[PDB]
Amino acid sequence: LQSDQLLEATVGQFMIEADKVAHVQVGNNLEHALLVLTKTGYTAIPVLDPSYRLHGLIGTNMIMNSIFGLERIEFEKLDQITVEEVMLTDIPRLHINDPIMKGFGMVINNGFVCVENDEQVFEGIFTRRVVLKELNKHIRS
Amino acid sequence: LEATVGQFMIEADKVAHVQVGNNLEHALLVLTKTGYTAIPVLDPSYRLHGLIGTNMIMNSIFGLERIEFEKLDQITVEEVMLTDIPRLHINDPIMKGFGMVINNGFVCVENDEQVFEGIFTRRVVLKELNKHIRS
Ligand SMILES: Nc1ncnc2c1ncn2[C@@H]1O[C@@H]2COP(=O)(O)O[C@H]3[C@@H](O)[C@H](n4cnc5c(N)ncnc54)O[C@@H]3COP(=O)(O)O[C@H]2[C@H]1O
Ligand SMILES: Nc1ncnc2c1ncn2[C@@H]1O[C@@H]2COP(=O)(O)O[C@H]3[C@@H](O)[C@H](n4cnc5c(N)ncnc54)O[C@@H]3COP(=O)(O)O[C@H]2[C@H]1O
Ligand SMILES: [Ca+2]
Ligand SMILES: [Cl-]
């Protein structure tokens, strides 16, 4: 894309596709979510329902806050609590056809924003890195 | 583009941090309570030694058979922290910091004496970029 086209593009053209996005499900326990976060190295990831609709975000700091006990880390709670009981549900959302400038504005306060289609099926994520890489390339010109 | 990193950075007195010698249980508590996913590690002379984050700490105790949470207070931050990190000076042009936050959520700023001065964050960059293109 040329500079005069970039600001005319859509969020979907620059999102990380869902098949490359690490995620978990509302009904998984915190142990599984902590495993996925730790093994993928991401600090927060999408939470989907069984029909692939976005319901929230789950991150390592959220999980640790739920098991940090008075005197010890209550690791047994990882198997006893589900991610939907701990996940953040007030998250921003983008549509695949949203103008890219909307996404540029939404990553000011968010490291990534989830993207969905007309039927609320999860389509991928719109990340700061992709924005910064692209804007750098074009500013430099 | 005529601006400097020091003009837009988050000043050090606003920055959450831990110190060399603190253990990982303390660092993990600070990360969890402040909500930040990675923060600087300083020494008593306020010099920057590295960055510590929640993912690093988890990976240091996540075993094949169990998560060894009970070892957190036996490991120091310097045994786990990331040390191969970019650095900026307060007088660096903003476009230099812009390039460094492509691969880093934040980049530490220090003076010519190696004293920590603040952090240059993606949010500050994105705020300014949004202003320039929206004009
Ligand atoms: N494996 C890796 N290789 C190279 N660089 C890496 C990396 N993991 C993290 N980074 C760098 O660290 C930044 C922050 O990652 P974090 O996990 O806190 O925060 C991430 C994470 O919460 C989420 N994310 C990114 N890619 C993801 C994926 N494939 N699946 C699930 N979540 C993802 O979006 C946030 C922003 O990601 P963004 O790429 O803008 O920014 C990333 C990236 O620049
Ligand atoms: N209390 C809060 N209030 C409002 N928004 C919040 C927030 N905590 C996090 N965020 C939002 O989440 C983004 C990523 O935070 P994270 O902790 O993964 O990654 C952060 C954290 O690693 C570090 N950081 C930012 N501010 C810090 C501070 N005052 N002290 C220590 N580290 C800081 O710099 C990274 C990039 O931060 P940036 O501000 O660009 O981007 C932040 C910010 O937009
Ligand atoms: Ca909201
Ligand atoms: Cl970030």
Rounded to the nearest 10 degrees, the angle between the axes of helix B54-61 and helix B24-34 is: 140
Alpha carbon distance B4, A135 (integer Å): 19
A129: buried, middle or exposed (CB in 10 Å: 19+, 13-18, 0-12)?
middle
B53 CA: nearest ligand 2 atom: 22
| DSSP state at residue A27 | T
Give the nearest chain A residue to B129 (CA atoms): A135
| A22 CB near ligand 1 (under 6 Å) | yes
The residue whose CA has the least distance to atom 37 of ligand 1 is A127
Q: What are phi and psi of B10, to 5 degrees?
A: -80, 120
Q: Render B90-111 in DSSP notation, one character per residue.
A: TTSBHHHHHHHTTS-SEEEEE-
Residue B107: both structure tokens together:
């980049």
Which among B74, B122, B131 is the top mutation candidate for probing chain A, defined by the most A β-carbons within 10 Å of its own β-carbon?
A: B122
Residue A127: both structure tokens together:
């990340």
- Name the residue among A69, A32, A41 with its Cα closest to residue B70: A69
Alpha carbon distance A116, A98 (integer Å): 10
Experimental method: X-ray
Is the CB of B99 less than 8 angstroms away from the CB of A59?
no
Q: Render B39-98 in DSSP notation, one character per residue.
A: EEEE-TT-BEEEEEEHHHHHHHHB-SS-B-GGGGGGSBGGGT-B----EEETTSBHHHHH
What are the residue ranges of helices labelled H in chain A? 3-6, 30-40, 60-67, 83-86, 100-106, 128-139
**DSSP-derived 3-state class of residue A58:** strand
Spans of all domains in chain B? 1-135
Bridge-partner residues for B42, per DSSP? B19, B48
